RNA sequence: GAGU
């Protein structure tokens, strides 16, 4: 038993591999992401939760008064989606916040005992996300994209070769906190350690810790190696450590207490090193012909009188020895700068650094900071500590924290906000080890290192912006009036909030139009992830570094997403089973191999994880449920890639789709297209129009159902169950008794859109697929969305398609097609424009909407109601007037001409300009809806009115129809309960049915059940009346509009959208082509069964290219075909079942190691014989990506098909009957009518609109504006040696008025002069040249 | 790399060789994107030295 | 001036008791005004956006360049 | 985005 609709039809799979765990909901990082930011969990600090625990409980300056957060309430939204679509409102609910003002005494130490007022303050509304993950703002659909970003923590760059002829090794570590100011520590040429407080400008990484209280002596001790040096009668000992002495040539004599060990001068090698240490060496015997050239620890002074003998850190000379022995001090300390392992660094900072103590310290930091402020030590202080170690301007939070705690190994994962002064030192620890070539580099591209913001993240950083500007105002007004008048309602204010909010939603750059035109566009582009936006790369910003491919994008962004050009490298998709752990890092899930045996566990992990263990590839061979069939296999790890055995082997992918996004995953011969292409064809498949007539691909992936029913464009069954009722408006169904609740009723609301309007003006209509009276379950779906068949995304059309060369007509990669393809009206789209007319008032006059027409034709008055309304569903043309519209005219003084012409005639002229929203030039089609738009003050117009009882008309009916039908299931389960125990049926059935207040019988578990579905009833009454209300209240309400406004008109137009010559087309493998030629079906050439062709390709277009899928396809296209039209011949030679079931089954066992098995033989003969007429019209087959069908199992179709096996056939010519001189390849394509239509991109203009300023034509023909010459263009002309037509771009098409208007006179009188003038531009110019002061004039001849 | 694709476009390549292609590929796009505008920058030059 | 001011400070108090916006009548009863001054004042209300304006998200174009002059007539109106 |  599978589920009844896959009964209605199923596809055949190919591949070998079956896929274990299942497909996720692709966009669950829009859901889940915004469900953080929502998230009412107590403890999680995420969203809302954070934001108030940061800001609160927020007090007083005094410390007497407090605002304390408690708890908040999102209102239930105030005016649904579809009204804010017309309304051009942006959909958001309200927000209200318990607070508690909290008021402590002076007088009383800290008796919180003084007022407590508890109350739910109004924080302003807040933008919803729709149920698909989209956002609603000002009227339209946008989508907020994933964005990549460098994480917080720290990185340890390499300049590598950079600057210098030397290519000096100069490493660097970069501090990114979350909130703050950032630090950089780099290395000098020099080898000497520079910070950059704010990448500012260089000076001393020491005195840094100058500034955090550390004298010179403290800070050579935490770096470099300390030594002990004893001075003893008069021979010098040092504490010597084993390990120090390793790898260094020889000089002096060393005796280990007795025995020698090491030969002077003679290297020492690692075994003298071992000797010496067990020997118990506490003091070896060293000359001083060593330390001349070391240097000093401490500042040593003479105890005796207290005189300054030698100071810290300096070079070590003879005389001074002497002196400092006998200040008594017999015990000194050497430090440890051997070069090598241990260079010379931090000493050599500090000789550069001619600053002192912590006070020129923090007067330089304040110095290079601020240039030009006296050093007054409050303001140091202040600057220092702030900067750095502040709660509200420092905050690295839990990611950045975490990610520093796994660049230095430390211990704790949990962070607080500010960086600890130990943090600090440790950076330069491991800088210091780098810079010795201890130490490895940070990869800036390593997936681990780029985190990825989903929305609710994103959200609540803006929303934290809102609350800091807030909490600037609020802590203000906390001091402001009295502690016992004021309230904290009237003190908190939402501006800045919503601003906050609608700016990030509205005009970040990350919150951009979705595509709409196919389920696939959107469901990808949601899922698309940007690193650029706020925190992340500009187009200049990115070199080479960012845009390059890394190896760890595997199973984690698809390699082949991505805008061509500028974008290109910027922007991925996620590829498909990837998804986001809880700090934003993007997991991929993978296979546990348990020491050689494959278990059924799965593990996410991170990137860095990834690297460490050994993974075996998808197609990498298997033995049952158990080891594997290979001794060495193929894997990757660290990165790289070959060949691995068993043992070490930790894990495999988990599918071959895993590497790869939505759109590529579609096509199906993806294994033998180049990625050139393989990316076109990606982006191509988002451009595609769904026509009405949607097609099931025939040549597939199985991947087709899961796209189509996650985009959510069609609908299905929540529960299912056995469908009661079905319109082409609503389709009801009665659930079955196991899933359905008792207390409530078990029918099923399935309101269906029709006819409606994408943002790209494509169409999306629901239509109903199965039966009334059918049984389907959980998850079935039961109408299509537009590009969409039973279930499966039916992006477009397949047809047959004969690779060869025609008379030119297929040139470079031009494409030919049969009229047939008009004739059935396939690649037919429809689309439906939104135009507006306002109604505003002027101090001019206020502008009315009525019929009233100056001086046009009563033809086109015609079409106008009492109103200036259209008639709904009239159908119309460019030029005709849609809506009328009034205007005061202004002054003109007519020429005497015209008056004298006006008093001849004497016609009613009256100062008013005509302002009737008229129809677009080159397109036309019925009207659907019109919109009316009345403002509160001034009364409607009769149409205004007439329309709004029309919205009545339809609104009542719903309303009623959904009460009734739901007692008709009530009363049935009632029924169905009463009918048990005392089987009552008749009585009942006659005795009225509003009458069944009156039944009872008896009690138990029962009349529990009868009273539940009894006080349903009464609950009906009330609530129902209280929709009604709701309903009646919106539509009559007064709309708020933008002031000066008087009323609105939009008004949806449709329009037919014929395939023609010059539109864009393509297919799944990136090959695209414009269309060249329509010829007659008798110019089409033939089939030996004489079916003519549909489409010609140019078979040239391919091989250099290097799209070899889409080759593949036609075969396997034909191939399906042929069993589906062997399948028709069958059928109407009825036969019988049960050879056609024998036929059939063999079919889907075709493959060669093929999955599916399905032996058949136990469904039902219905089930039978309507799967029969589905897949009449061809079998739908499914080659998946990697592990699909290949070349052997397609040959072997095609026999069985009645195939020759090449799948190449002898072709009659239409036109002559000769038959073609070899065999060419045809079959079925499935492809695509694209989003460009040269309907649009034709623009015709000779005169219209100016520019205000330079007087230069705008552009396009948005506005009838002219094209541009451009630089480039100039140089042509002046290629060659055409004067006057340059002269003509330069002035008389350009901003010579006088030029344009005397020579279209000539033109028309017959004269065909230039007449030449002066480009207005160029006396922009000059005028411009002496604004700025410079003298810039014409010179008299 | 050391390793190159065995398989050929009418065998399929598999996931690992598909990978590896795509380094190359999309290398090449950028360069077209970026390199075009340099050599416009070089012809503007020239062009407006005679 | 001095009308502009007490409008916004009042705006606060209306949209946070009503839970959205207040309607032009709405705002008026609270003023003590006559609605037509009300909704002539708030056509008033808007200050000027720069012609400069980058009206391109991309920078693309700077207001100008979709400016349109009522003042030049056609040369076939000039005919 | 399209294309050169
Ligand atoms: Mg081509």
């Avoid at chain 1, 407080?197 to 100058?210: E, F, H, N, Q, Y």
């Avoid at chain 1, 460019?878 to 809506?883: F, K, N, P, R, T």
Wanted: net charge negative; with cysteine; glycine share 8%.
């Amino acid at each position: 038993v599978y589920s009844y609709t896959e009964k209605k039809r199923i596809r055949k799979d190919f591949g070998k591999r079956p896929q274990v765990l299942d497909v996720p909901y692709l966009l669950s990082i829009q859901l889940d992401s915004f469900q953080k930011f929502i998230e009412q969990d107590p403890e999680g600090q995420y969203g809302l939760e954070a934001a108030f625990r940061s800001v609160f409980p927020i007090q007083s300056y005094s410390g007497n008064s407090e605002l304390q957060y408690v708890s908040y309430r999102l209102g239930e939204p105030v005016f649904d989606v579809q009204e804010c679509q017309i309304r051009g409102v942006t959909y958001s609910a309200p927000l209200r916040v318990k607070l508690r003002l909290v008021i402590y005494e002076r007088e009383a130490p800290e008796g919180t005992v003084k007022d407590i007022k508890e109350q739910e303050v109004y924080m302003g509304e807040i933008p919803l996300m729709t149920d698909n993950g989209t956002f609603v703002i000002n009227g339209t659909e946008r989508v907020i994209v994933s964005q990549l970003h460098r994480s917080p923590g720290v990185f340890f760059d390499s300049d590598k070769g950079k600057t210098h002829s030397s290519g000096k090794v100069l490493y660097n570590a970069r501090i990114i906190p979350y909130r703050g100011s950032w630090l950089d520590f780099e290395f000098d040429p020099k080898d000497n350690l520079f910070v950059r407080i704010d990448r500012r400008r260089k000076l001393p990484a020491t005195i840094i810790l100058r500034a955090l209280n550390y004298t010179t002596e403290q800070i050579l001790d935490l770096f470099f190696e300390k030594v002990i040096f004893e001075i003893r009668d008069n021979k010098l000992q040092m504490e010597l450590v084993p390990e120090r002495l390793r790898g260094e040539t020889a000089s002096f004599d060393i005796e280990a207490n007795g025995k020698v060990y090491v030969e002077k001068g003679r290297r020492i090698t690692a075994r003298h090193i071992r000797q010496l240490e067990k020997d118990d060496v506490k003091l070896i015997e060293v000359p001083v012909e060593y330390i001349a050239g070391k240097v000093v620890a401490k500042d040593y002074i003479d105890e005796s009188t207290g005189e300054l003998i030698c100071a810290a850190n300096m070079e070590l000379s003879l005389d001074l020895l002497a002196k400092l022995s006998q200040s008594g001090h017999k015990r000194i300390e050497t430090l440890f700068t051997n070069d090598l392992d241990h260079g010379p660094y931090i000493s050599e900072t500090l000789r550069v650094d001619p600053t002192n103590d912590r006070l020129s310290a923090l007067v330089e930091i304040y110095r290079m900071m601020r240039p030009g402020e006296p050093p007054t030590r409050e303001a140091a202080e202040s600057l220092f500590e702030n900067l750095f170690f502040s709660e509200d301007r420092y905050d690295l939070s839990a990611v950045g924290r975490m990610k520093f705690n796994r660049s230095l190994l430390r211990e704790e994962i949990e962070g607080s906000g500010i960086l600890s002064k130990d943090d600090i030192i440790d950076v330069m620890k491991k800088l210091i080890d780098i810079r010795n070539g201890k130490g490895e580099v940070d990869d800036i591209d390593h997936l681990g290192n780029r985190r990825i913001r989903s929305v609710g993240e994103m959200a609540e950083n803006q929303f934290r912006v809102g609350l800091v500007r807030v909490e600037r105002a609020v802590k203000e007004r906390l001091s402001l009036g009295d502690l016992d008048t004021l309230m904290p309602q009237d003190m908190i204010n939402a501006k800045p909030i919503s601003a906050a909010v609608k700016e990030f939603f509205g005009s970040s750059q990350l919150s951009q139009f979705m595509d709409q035109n196919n389920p696939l566009s959107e469901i990808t582009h949601k899922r698309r992830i940007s690193a650029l936006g706020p925190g992340g790369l500009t187009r200049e910003r990115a070199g080479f570094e960012v845009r390059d491919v890394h190896p760890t994008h595997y199973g984690r962004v698809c390699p082949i997403e991505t805008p061509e050009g500028p974008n290109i490298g910027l922007i991925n998709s996620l590829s498909v089973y990837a998804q986001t752990n809880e700090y934003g890092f993007l997991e991929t899930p993978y296979r546990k191999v348990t020491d050689g045996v494959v278990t059924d566990e799965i593990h996410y992990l991170s990137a860095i994880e990834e690297g460490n263990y050994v993974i075996a590839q998808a197609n990498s061979n298997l033995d049952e449920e158990g080891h594997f069939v290979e001794d060495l296999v193929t894997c990757r790890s660290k990165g790289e890639s070959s060949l691995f055995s068993r043992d070490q082997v930790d894990y495999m992918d988990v599918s071959t789709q895993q590497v790869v996004s939505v759109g590529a995953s579609l096509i199906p011969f993806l294994e033998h297209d180049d990625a050139n292409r393989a990316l076109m064809g990606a982006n191509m498949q988002r451009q595609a129009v769904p026509t009405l007539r949607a097609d099931k691909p025939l040549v597939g992936t199985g991947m087709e159902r899961a796209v189509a029913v996650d985009s959510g464009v069609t609908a299905v069954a929540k529960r299912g169950g056995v469908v009661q009722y079905v319109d082409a408006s609503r389709i009801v169904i009665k659930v079955n008794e196991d899933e359905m609740y008792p207390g409530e009723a078990g029918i099923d609301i399935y309101n269906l859109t029709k006819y409606t309007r994408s943002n790209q003006n494509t169409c999306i209509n629901q239509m109903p697929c199965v039966s009334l009276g059918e049984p389907v379950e959980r998850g079935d779906v039961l109408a299509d969305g537009p590009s969409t068949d039973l279930g499966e995304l039916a992006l477009g059309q397949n047809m047959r398609v004969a690779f060869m060369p025609w008379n030119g007509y297929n040139f470079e990669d031009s494409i030919l097609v049969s009229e047939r393809v008009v004739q059935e009206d396939r690649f037919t789209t429809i689309h439906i424009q939104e135009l507006a007319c306002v109604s505003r008032d002027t101090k001019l006059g206020p502008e009315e909407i009525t019929a009233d027409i100056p001086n046009v034709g009563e033809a086109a008055l015609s079409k106008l109601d009492e109103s200036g309304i259209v008639y709904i569903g009239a159908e119309v043309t460019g030029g005709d007037i849609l809506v009328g519209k009034v205007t005061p005219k202004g002054e003109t003084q007519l020429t005497p001409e015209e008056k004298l012409l006006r008093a001849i005639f004497g016609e009613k002229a009256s100062d008013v300009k005509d302002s009737s929203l008229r129809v677009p030039n080159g397109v036309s089609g019925t009207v659907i809806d019109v919109q009316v738009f009345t403002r509160d003050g001034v009364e409607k117009d009769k149409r205004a009115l007439e329309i709004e009882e029309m919205q009545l008309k339809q609104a009542k009916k719903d309303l009623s129809e959904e009460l009734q039908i739901l007692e008709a299931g009530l009363f049935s389960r009632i029924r169905a309960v009463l009918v048990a125990g005392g089987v009552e049926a008749e009585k009942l059935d006659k005795l009225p049915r509003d009458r069944w207040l009156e039944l009872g019988l008896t009690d138990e578990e029962k009349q529990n059940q009868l009273e539940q579905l009894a006080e349903q009833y009464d609950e009906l009454k009330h609530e129902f009346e209280k929709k009604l209300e709701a309903k009646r209240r919106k539509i009559t309400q007064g709309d708020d509009l933008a002031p000066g406004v008087l009323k609105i008109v939009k008004v949806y137009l449709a329009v037919k959208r014929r395939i023609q010559p010059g539109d864009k087309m393509a297919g799944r493998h990136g090959n695209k082509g414009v269309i060249s030629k329509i010829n007659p079906i008798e110019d089409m050439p033939y089939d030996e069964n004489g079916t003519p062709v549909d489409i010609v390709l140019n078979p040239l277009g391919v091989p250099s290219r290097m799209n070899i899928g889409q080759i593949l396809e036609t075969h396997l296209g034909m191939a399906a075909k042929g069993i589906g039209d062997k399948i028709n011949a069958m059928l109407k030679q009825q036969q019988e079942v049960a050879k056609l079931r024998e036929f059939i089954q063999r079919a889907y066992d075709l493959g060669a190691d093929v999955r599916q098995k399905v032996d058949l033989s136990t469904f039902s003969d219905e089930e039978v014989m309507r799967l029969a007429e589905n897949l009449r019209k061809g079998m739908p087959i499914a080659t998946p990506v990697f592990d699909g069908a290949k070349e052997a199992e397609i040959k072997e179709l095609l026999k069985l098909g009645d195939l020759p096996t090449s799948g190449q056939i002898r072709l009659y010519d239409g036109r002559t009957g000769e038959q073609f001189e070899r065999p060419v390849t045809v079959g079925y394509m499935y492809m695509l009518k694209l989003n460009h239509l040269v309907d649009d991109k034709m623009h015709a203009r000779s005169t219209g609109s100016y520019s205000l300023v330079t007087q230069q034509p705008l552009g396009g023909k948005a506005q009838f504006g002219g094209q541009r010459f451009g630089e480039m263009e100039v140089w042509a002309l002046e290629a060659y040696g055409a004067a006057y037509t340059l002269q003509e771009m330069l002035t008389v098409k350009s901003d010579d008025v006088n030029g344009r208007t005397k020579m279209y006179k000539n033109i028309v009188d017959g004269n065909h002069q230039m007449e030449p003038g002066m480009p207005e531009s160029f006396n922009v110019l000059l005028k411009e040249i002496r604004s700025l002061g410079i003298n810039i004039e014409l010179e008299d001849e | 790399i050391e390793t190159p694709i065995t398989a050929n476009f009418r065998e399929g390549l598999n996931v690992l060789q598909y990978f590896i292609s795509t380094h190359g590929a999309r290398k090449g796009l950028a360069d077209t994107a970026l390199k075009t505008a340099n050599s416009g920058y070089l012809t503007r030059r020239l062009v407006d030295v005679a | 001036i001095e009308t502009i001011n007490k409008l916004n400070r009042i705006s606060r108090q209306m949209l946070q008791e009503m839970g959205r916006e207040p309607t032009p009548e709405e705002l008026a009863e609270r003023m003590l005004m006559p609605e037509d001054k009300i909704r002539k004042v708030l056509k008033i209300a808007k200050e000027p956006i720069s012609m400069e304006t980058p009206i391109g998200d991309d920078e693309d174009s700077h207001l100008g360049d979709f400016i349109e002059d009522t003042t030049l007539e056609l040369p076939l109106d000039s005919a």
